[PDB]
């Protein structure tokens, strides 16, 4: 029930701005400080920014200080990170995290726990671009091998993150998503496969639901032989 | 600043055995309150890391009873008591004694099981796929063991070099196996230039190479 649900990833160019958002439920939010982690392939996880619970006292890490601010308001329960003057290095998944609480008469440890689930932020000159998706399909070959694989290939898109569901999430078991390659293009590339019975290949429907926020799509593929 | 240092940073492990990873920071961690901040998280694949120990030795809500945390000053350890399967994961180390909060650069838990032979399959292009500029073949291996593996294209009967990728999951949670997919892109033009497609698939688990194949059309 303690739960962060962080919102407002996605791409800027170069000096531009974001502000990323993380909502708070289940608990007293007024009551604890909070903080902003991120993290990137190269540099592992980097604490950005602390902010105390009434949202008077702030700090940040020198990588980013004078170009990123941290915010709360209480009564919407909401923590607020202001990105200003962007950097290419920049570009990471950006955490919020809970941490000291505090008390009538005195303040307890230090933490960061629990985190919310994580936004990606892009800096870059590119442009955004939506995915293709193209079904990954068998043919009506192996019969007597008794597990068939299908999947989607979803092309070209930028920037990252793409999410890749089957039949609304409820196909879950044997799925397997690939971490996405970025191509000589500039453009990223992945599939998503899953394993079903050959007994189910015109038995039951399959369909890849492939998110791709950054450009504003949700493309549904069923996939047929 | 303070220096988070951890080893060892793989871990190869046999289900059932004990797992211990160290921390090692650089500068004593004890707060003027009298509690060290030291914590430990896991992390899976696309998920943010979740926290299992913290304050060197005290377990989070809810975390199973086999992890356990111990040590003092600047030299710190996580422990497993019998790893399942489920303990598969980047681990770090982090510090909350001092701003700025630093972390370790996280150790690999990699879980030893039983050799698998990849199930190998090949998808040949979309019809779809044609009338844009370019054509992907995608050829996956599916739940094997270990993650050591060979993919070689051939067109035609031919060996094909410099137009292939390779994607790898991380070892699953559940049955410990990876997966791999090899994607072959060609312009429009030369996918029509060839009838042939095939991958050939060469693993530990496999007594001789596995070769899958389709004919354009």
């Known amino acids: 029930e303690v739960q962060l649900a962080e919102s407002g990833g996605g791409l800027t160019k170069p000096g531009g701005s974001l502000r990323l958002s993380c909502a708070a439920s289940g608990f007293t939010f007024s009551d604890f400080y909070m903080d902003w982690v991120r993290q990137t392939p190269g540099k592992g996880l980097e604490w950005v920014s602390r902010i105390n619970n009434d949202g008077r006292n702030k700090w940040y890490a020198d990588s980013v200080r004078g170009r990123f601010t941290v915010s709360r308001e209480n009564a919407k329960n909401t923590l607020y990170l202001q990105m200003d003057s962007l950097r290419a290095e920049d570009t990471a998944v950006y955490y919020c995290?809970?941490?000291?609480?505090?008390?009538?008469?005195?303040?307890?440890?230090?933490?960061?726990?629990?985190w919310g689930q994580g936004v990606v932020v892009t800096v870059s000159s590119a442009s955004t671009k939506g995915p293709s998706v193209f079904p990954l399909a068998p043919s009506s070959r192996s019969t007597s091998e008794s597990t068939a694989a299908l999947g989607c290939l979803v092309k070209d898109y930028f920037p990252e993150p793409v999410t890749v569901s089957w039949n609304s999430g409820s196909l879950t078991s044997g799925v397997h998503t690939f971490p996405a390659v970025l191509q000589s293009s500039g453009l990223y590339s992945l599939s998503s496969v899953v394993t079903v019975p050959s007994s189910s290949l015109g038995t039951q429907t399959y369909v890849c639901n492939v998110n791709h926020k950054p450009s504003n799509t949700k493309v549904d593929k069923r996939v047929e032989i | 600043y303070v220096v988070m240092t951890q080893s060892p940073l793989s871990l190869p492990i046999t289900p059932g055995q004990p797992a211990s990873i160290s921390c090692r920071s650089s500068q004593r961690l004890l707060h003027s309150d009298g509690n060290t901040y030291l914590a430990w998280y896991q992390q899976r694949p696309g998920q943010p890391p979740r926290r299992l120990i913290y304050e060197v030795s005290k377990l989070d809500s809810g975390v199973p009873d086999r992890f356990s945390g111990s040590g003092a000053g600047t030299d710190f350890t996580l422990k497993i008591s019998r790893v399942e399967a489920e303990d598969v994961g980047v681990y770090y180390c982090?510090?909350?004694?001092?701003?700025?909060?630093?972390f370790g650069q996280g150790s690999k838990v990699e879980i030893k099981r039983a050799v698998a032979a990849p199930s190998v399959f090949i998808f040949p292009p979309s019809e779809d796929q044609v009338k844009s500029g370019t054509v992907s073949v995608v050829c996956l291996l599916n739940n094997f063991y270990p993650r050591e593996a060979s993919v070689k294209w051939k067109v035609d009967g031919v060996l094909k070099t410099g137009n292939s990728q390779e994607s790898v999951t991380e070892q699953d949670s559940k049955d410990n196996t990876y997966s791999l997919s090899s994607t072959l892109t060609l312009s429009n033009t030369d996918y029509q230039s060839h009838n042939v497609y095939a991958c050939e698939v060469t693993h530990q688990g496999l007594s001789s190479p596995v070769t899958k194949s389709f004919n354009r059309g």
């Open positions: 982090g510090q909350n004694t001092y701003l700025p909060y630093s």
């Open positions: 995290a809970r941490d000291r609480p505090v008390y009538r008469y005195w303040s307890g440890g230090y933490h960061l726990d629990p």
